[PDB]
Amino acid sequence: ANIVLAYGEWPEYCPATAVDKPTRPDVSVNRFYTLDSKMWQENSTGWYWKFPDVLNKTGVFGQNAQFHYLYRSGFCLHVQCNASKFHQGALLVAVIPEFVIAGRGSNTKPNEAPHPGFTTTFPGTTGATFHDPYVLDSGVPLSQALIYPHQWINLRTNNCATVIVPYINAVPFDSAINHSNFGLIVIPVSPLKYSSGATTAIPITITIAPLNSEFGGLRQ
């Protein structure tokens, strides 16, 4: 297996000037949180996830990230896409720091222009599909989206990908609720094809390991 390390750095702890030492669970949060499978089809567009609000409703990590105030962690992403040997296609999986969803419209007035809702900017544990995957729903072309840490999931070579991504932020601590740090994007660059009689949809499974988590400022 090939492991792509995001920007050549491993997630490590904070070396801050807070006397209240940030806690380290190490036990109930360093487990493989497995999201639901996405049903990739012929007319699919892609999917994106916002990470520090993907796991805010799930178990010990969600409870210890909602009831704290300061947050810092790295991630180990692992994406399986298990298809048969008669299907064909390609996926592009890539992480993007500060992935801002743009609004689609043709209005230039400030409070008249459209803006994405809460279920579009912060999808949750179920993700969200692209409307225009050619511009990443941000006005930025995906042809040069290989500048990010990325892998190709080609259905004739392998079926898995893995991305170890550290904490990328200007401040070493941040609220895990009011700020999504980075997003995951899977895009079917080459569409899915299959002869008649095969499975008409391929599942995509994602598991996440919160490496090196740190929480601060416990409150009700």
Binding site: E98, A113, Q144
Partner: protein, 214 residues
């Protein structure tokens, strides 16, 4: 010709990529009579023009000092020796509300007194962010980043000219982090990366066939 030799490796650094004295803002002054406008403020934002915005949306984090050069002309072009006050308002300090208000006499707002016949004004502004670097792409939910910039004509009574100042910005000591692709769709707003769902412009102009060399 046929360039066989190798080029230079100094014009591709980030510091050279950004450091150059470029025009960043244009401020109009009127100094009228009945309509007591008098002053003209200008908030500092490097995303004003669409030429440096495309170069600074290439990177996620940036850190730089700034040099501001103030070139003030009149309507026709002649420079009469009038005294001018430029004033830098730090982030958090209130903006001046009148031509003769108390925000101009405030001692903690650094001012520059320079004439029209003088060489143009030049100041340097350091890194004034509470974080470790600037960031234009903020994914989340929460005003001002660098400071406000005002200017008036120092006089007891009111003058009868309309000025026109150009704020030329140069960057220095720039550092960048986390590159990101270059935006191909046109702009619609100033603070938002909104593109148009209809009429998506292709990033490569069309040709006749795939089997040619057009």
């Amino acid at each position: 010709r046929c360039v066989v030799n190798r080029n230079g490796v100094l014009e591709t650094t980030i510091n050279h990529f950004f450091s150059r004295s470029g025009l960043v803002g244009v401020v109009n002054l009127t100094d009228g009579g009945t309509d007591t406008t008098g002053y003209a403020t200008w908030d500092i934002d490097i995303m004003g023009f669409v030429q440096l915005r495309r170069k600074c949306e290439m990177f996620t984090y940036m850190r730089f000092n700034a040099e501001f050069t103030f070139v003030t002309t009149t309507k026709n072009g002649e420079a009469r020796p009038y005294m001018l006050q430029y004033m830098y308002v730090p982030p958090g300090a209130p903006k001046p509300t009148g031509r003769d208000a108390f925000q101009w006499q405030t001692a903690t707002n650094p001012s520059v007194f320079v004439k029209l016949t003088d060489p143009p004004a030049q100041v340097s502004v350091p890194f004034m962010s509470p974080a470790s670097a600037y960031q234009w792409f903020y994914d989340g939910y929460p005003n001002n980043m660098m400071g406000t910039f005002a200017v008036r004509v120092v006089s007891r009574e009111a003058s009868q000219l309309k000025l026109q100042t150009r704020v030329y910005m140069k960057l220095k000591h720039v550092r960048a982090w986390v590159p990101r692709p270059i935006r191909s769709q046109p702009y619609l707003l100033k603070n938002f990366p909104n593109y148009d769902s209809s009429k998506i412009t292709n990033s490569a102009r069309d040709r006749s066939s795939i089997k040619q060399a057009n």
